[PDB]
Amino acid sequence: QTREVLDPIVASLMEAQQIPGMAIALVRPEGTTISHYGAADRETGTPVDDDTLFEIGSLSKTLTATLASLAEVEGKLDFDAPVSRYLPELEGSAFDDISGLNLGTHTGGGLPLFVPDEVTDRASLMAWYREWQPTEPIGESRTYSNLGIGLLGLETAASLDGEFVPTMRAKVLAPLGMQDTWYDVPEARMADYAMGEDKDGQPTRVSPGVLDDEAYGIKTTAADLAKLVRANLHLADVDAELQQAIDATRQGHYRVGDMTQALIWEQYSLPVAPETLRAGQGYDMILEPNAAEALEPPQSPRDDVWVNKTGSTQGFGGYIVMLPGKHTGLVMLANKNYPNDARVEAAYRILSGLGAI
């Protein structure tokens, strides 16, 4: 079937990259197929199964985006408004000139990638935000930023008068039925938490940190992510405002060379070459400022695109692809941080082999 296309590609991928285990969800009209491969923990050999939790790292940003979008749909958050309107503790800073939308598209004035070590809590974070000077023109340059998506999360929480994680659970996760999705893995599910493996083959598990929940802190299953994918693909039964919020996360906001930056989601018009996709996940895109052009032939969500998002921690490597025009989606989770080049190739081969491209 489907699995005769999928299984040898993942087998070959896990051999070539020495990945201990994977969980894969394929979302199509007709339904969702979940496949589990290998070990959740290389040392114990406990197999990956329907309960195995993977760190999705930077994929967590798509949830942050979604919640921000819902606050927008509810009229509580204005995406074009200065962030300091919702966080008055930043009045008088650069955040008088930077919007939620900038934060959700990484066009916040060159806002850097990492949280600085000197920042150890919310108060030191706010004080750092207050003192920071933009280094790139706002809304005209893209720099991938944990500080930015993190600040969007803090903006959103304030706009909704709630704490980030419980608000995310109540407003996005529970309504999508994502009941295996955690910011903090419960004691009772620790036996289900996969062990990561780093590029050197060493066991590793994500550490907590400032803005962890907002930027990289989700542990979840491939099935749960498939529900977010299903809703993005209009294959779920969802509340109308939540559907709207989800759809709005795929609105194209900036052209960035060959890539279109939507709300955290990144996309390309079809047909797209794999080398273009690989470039999207490379050093030149991820670790350098890229010219970004606001789209004012303003784009509604498109039905002729490859939509993607990578997610990593030190021990884990995830990837989501969505093809709205084919109503098809792919979630690949691994407990090894393996190269993005291989993530793209494997996803392209799977989707092509299934006839979706």
Q: Does 66 bind Cl ion (CB under 5 A)?
A: no
DSSP letter string, 119-133: --SHHHHHHHHHHPP
Give the integer Cα–Cα distance in Å for 9 and 31. 21
Which positions from 87 to 126 touch Cl ion by CB under 5 A, shown as an x/- string?
---------------------------xx-----------
Cα 285 from chain centroid? 16
Give the active site residue among 37, 58, 183, 312: 58
Q: What is the DSSP letter of 314?
A: T
- Residue 271 preceded by cis peptide, ω within 30: yes
In 3-state terms, what secondary structure has residue 170? helix
- From the CB of 215, what's the least distance to Cl ion, in Å? 6
The interface partner of residue 146, options being Sr ion, Cl ion, none and the CB cut-off 5 to 8 Å by kind, is Cl ion
- Minimal CB distance residue for Cl ion: 115
319 catalytic? Reply is no
186 touches Cl ion by CB under 5 A: no
Known binding residue 121? Answer is no
Work out whether 214 is an interface residue with Sr ion (CB under 5 A). no
CB 253 within 8 A of CB 295: yes
Give the residue from 248, 234, 209 showing the smallest Cα distance to 67: 248
d(CA 72, CA 83): 13
- 224: contact with Sr ion by CB under 5 A: no
The active-site residue out of 37, 86, 129, 144 is 144
80 assigned binding-site residue: yes
Residue type for position 297:
P
Q: Pick one of Cl ion, Sr ion, none as the site partner of residue 114 (Cβ within 5 to 8 A by kind).
A: Cl ion
What is the pattern of x (binds Cl ion, CB under 5 A) and - over residues 126-155? --------------------x---------
Q: What angle do CA 239, 356, 354 make, to 5 degrees?
A: 115
Contact 347, 339 (CB under 8 A): no
Residue 213 touching Sr ion (CB under 5 A): yes
Active site residue 144: yes
Using alpha carbons, select from 73, 93, 69, 71 the residue that is nearest to residue 83.
93
In the bound state with Sr ion, the residue whose beta carbon lies nearer, of 180 and 212, is 212
Hey, what are 136's tokens? Answer: 């790139």
Of the candidates 322, 156, 316, 293, the one whose C-alpha atom is nearest the C-alpha of residue 232 is 322
Of 80, 118, 187, 237, the one binding Sr ion (CB under 5 A) is: 80
Footprint of Cl ion on this chain (CB under 5 A)? 114-115, 146
Q: Would you list which residues are annotated within the binding site?
A: 51, 78, 80, 117, 192, 212-213, 284, 288, 345
Q: Would you please indicate which residues are annotated as catalytic (active-site) residues?
A: 58, 144
Footprint of Sr ion on this chain (CB under 5 A)? 80, 212-213
Q: Would you list which residues are annotated within the binding site for Ca(2+)?
A: 51, 78, 80, 117, 192, 212-213, 284, 288, 345
